[PDB]
Amino acid sequence: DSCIQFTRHASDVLLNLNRLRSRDILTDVVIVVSREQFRAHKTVLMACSGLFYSIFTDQLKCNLSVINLDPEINPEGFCILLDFMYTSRLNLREGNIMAVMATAMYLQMEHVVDTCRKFIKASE
Amino acid sequence: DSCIQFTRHASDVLLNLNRLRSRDILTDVVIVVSREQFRAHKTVLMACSGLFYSIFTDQLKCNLSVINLDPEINPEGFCILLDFMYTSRLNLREGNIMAVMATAMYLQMEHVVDTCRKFIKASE
Amino acid sequence: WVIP
Amino acid sequence: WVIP
Ligand SMILES: O=C1Cc2cc(Nc3ncncc3Cl)ccc2N1
Numbered sequence A, B: 001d002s003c004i005q006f007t008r009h010a011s012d013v014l015l016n017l018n019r020l021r022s023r024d025i026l027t028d029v030v031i032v033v034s035r036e037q038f039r040a041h042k043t044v045l046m047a048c049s050g051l052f053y054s055i056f057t058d059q060l061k062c063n064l065s066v067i068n069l070d071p072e073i074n075p076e077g078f079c080i081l082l083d084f085m086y087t088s089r090l091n092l093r094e095g096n097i098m099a100v101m102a103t104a105m106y107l108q109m110e111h112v113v114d115t116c117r118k119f120i121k122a123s124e
Numbered sequence C, D: 001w002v003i004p
């Protein structure tokens, strides 16, 4: 087509979605991790994670307001990944990289799994 | 902080939100324009428009599944703007610029209003 | 704004 | 990935 494009549009949308998350506006699901609860928007989770995409396209699970993650999932790893979903920023540190990569593999967040593999390979 | 950032994350999120819109997945509102109906996600509309932000933060209107726009709003202008919200791409043409700018002023989409004003000024 |  |  002959469209024009606003370079900062996608980033401004994500920033606003994160402001809604901060203020708990229109959040429609609770993610339960080892008795730690995280409120979020189903559409943002689906847009970021192959696991959430599969969960919320399921005709029965699409209607659930609570999702319980596998007990092996670390709440801090999940929190770091949820923040990444809403900001594009990943707080990757020596002390959390193993939990973050394990959580990203479970959530099916391929780009995160890729940078974790590379950061681990550089330290060996 | 010491975060790393994935450059394409915001764009990939918006692309996935638009794929959900295309497939009518988790859309939670109908926008009615001069008897033309558009299905969308409330959070994306709020993230893009000062008008939708104000509507869906209202304690009564936040729960509505149908929103009727002012009858002066042109359905094509709305359609072009809805596409822009979900893609960052604006189909601005000589034949639609007046309807698009009027719709963007009503929806409170300041960056769109800005490029319409500039494109109009260049033709005078 | 840009030409994509 | 970049340093923001
Ligand atoms: O690594 C990843 C990130 C990711 C996101 C999603 N999401 C969607 N895919 C396609 N259409 C709509 C949506 Cl919402 C699916 C798989 C994966 N895998």
Ligand SMILES: O=C1Cc2cc(Nc3ncncc3Cl)ccc2N1
Pocket: A016, A017, A019, A020, B046, B047, B048, B049, B050, B051, B053, B108, B109, B110, B111
């Ligand atoms: O031009 C514009 C675009 C736009 C978007 C919004 N959205 C939000 N603002 C702040 N926190 C959350 C959200 Cl969702 C408000 C005003 C305007 N004005």
Ligand SMILES: [Cl-]
Pocket: A048, A109, A110, A111, A112, A113
């Ligand atoms: Cl990812």
Ligand SMILES: [Cl-]
Pocket: B048, B109, B110, B111, B112, B113
């Ligand atoms: Cl705008």
